[PDB]
Amino acid sequence: GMPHVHVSTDNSLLDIGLIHRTLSQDTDWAKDIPLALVQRAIDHSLCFGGFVDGRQVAFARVISDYATFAYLGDVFVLPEHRGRGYSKALMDAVMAHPDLQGLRRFSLATSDAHGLYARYGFTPPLFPQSLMERYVPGLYST
């Protein structure tokens, strides 16, 4: 039952339109995100695409200095491709990536997938009172 999925970090293979539609329409965190921002974001991130039979089926995106800090977001698997290990394939590649080793902090935000990310060593923050943000959820809508 092992997945047959290709995982790449070559942005040229990404299906930008698929990613844009998915993020814009089928996520809350990137609802209504403009195409130009999707493209710019990808251009300045370490992106993981998962592909089957010539089509993109999954995505994960890391923003990092490749030295001290990384942030994970935009993780998805298309609904018809779920339960096949494609999320795990991408996370395994993130955790193993040679430019994402030895980091002091790897951060993410999740509405309802805490148990999942816990299997990769993520925890609630050590020092939650230290954290601050300028955060505008729903920025792109209007």
Place this chain on the structure above:
Amino acid sequence: GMPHVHVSTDNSLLDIGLIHRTLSQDTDWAKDIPLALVQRAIDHSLCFGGFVDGRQVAFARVISDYATFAYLGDVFVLPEHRGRGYSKALMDAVMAHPDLQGLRRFSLATSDAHGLYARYGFTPPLFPQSLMERYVPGLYST
């Protein structure tokens, strides 16, 4: 009483040795950080240096996709240069930088400077239970 300080985002002007010594020896968050990691981090970040009379006096570092997310860290002013507005000069430049506009989330962690960052619009997290990390404080020591 306005500061006379030059703020640059040109990494070629940075005094890498000063930054390395400062971070390694005079901060807790980067205690014992190796030079090679400082250099790599800088190479993959948007860095703000503050300079007076040919010497670097202050620093701030942003990791971002220049589209959706940024993380601020490594902020310092050398002790003999404090109280002159150099922190504010750098933060003003961060907040105004053309590649850091329109972001959904700008994040940071601070032990004891919450009131300060609050003046730039930073708040405690909206959704603290969503946050997770792989965080190893004191990674570089040993």
